[PDB]
């Protein structure tokens, strides 16, 4: 069941990015810009490569009624794409909306 599958994928991590390629090898400038912003802000995120699975690539566009990528999800909710992530960065609310990892030490 595809809807169940897409619910699970969008909720796979506190912050989930659907992109062309991976964060280390982004395969589109729009995806590259997205990952750069997230990395710069030290956002904690997992990602899914839409080139890896065409059923997910097309199904998620219909499921979320969002006709392109990249798409950022936080807590399973669609935040949006590149333009929205830039606006949040610009208004300084990106860091508030998104999760970040603990930076505690593993030594005393």
Swiss-Prot record:
> What subcellular locations does the record give?
Cytoplasm, Cytosol; Cytoplasm, Cell cortex; Cytoplasm, Myofibril, Sarcomere, Z line
Q: What does this protein do?
A: Together with BOLA2, acts as a cytosolic iron-sulfur (Fe-S) cluster assembly factor that facilitates [2Fe-2S] cluster insertion into a subset of cytosolic proteins. Acts as a critical negative regulator of cardiac hypertrophy and a positive inotropic regulator. Required for hemoglobin maturation. Does not possess any thyoredoxin activity since it lacks the conserved motif that is essential for catalytic activity.
List residues binding [2Fe-2S] cluster.
Answer: 28
Would you say which domain of life the source belongs to? Eukaryota
Molecular-function GO terms, alphabetical? identical protein binding; iron-sulfur cluster binding; metal ion binding; protein kinase C binding; RNA binding
Domain notes per entry: The thioredoxin domain lacks the two redox-active cysteines. This strongly suggests that it lacks thioredoxin activity.
Q: Does the keyword RNA-binding apply?
A: no
Keyword Transferase applies = no
What does the record say about tissue specificity? Expressed in heart, spleen, testis and, to a lower extent, in thymus and peripheral blood leukocytes. Weakly expressed in lung, placenta, colon and small intestine.
Q: Where is the Glutaredoxin domain?
A: 13-101
| Subunit structure, as described in the record | Homodimer; the homodimer is independent of 2Fe-2S clusters. Heterotrimer; forms a heterotrimeric complex composed by two BOLA2 molecules and one GLRX3 molecule; linked by [2Fe-2S] clusters. Interacts (via N-terminus) with PRKCQ/PKC-theta. Interacts (via C-terminus) with CSRP3. Interacts with CSRP2.
One GO BP annotation of this record: iron-sulfur cluster assembly
Full protein name: Glutaredoxin-3
Recorded GO cellular component terms are: cell cortex; cytoplasm; cytosol; dendrite; iron-sulfur cluster assembly complex; nucleus; Z disc
Which organism is this protein's natural source? Answer: Homo sapiens
Keywords from UniProt, A to Z, are:
Acetylation, Cytoplasm, Iron, Iron-sulfur, Metal-binding, Phosphoprotein, Repeat
A further note on this protein reads: Silencing of Grx3 in HeLa cells decreases the activities of several cytosolic Fe/S proteins, such as ACO1, a major component of post-transcriptional iron regulation. As a consequence, Grx3-depleted cells show decreased levels of ferritin and increased levels of transferrin receptor, features characteristic of cellular iron starvation.
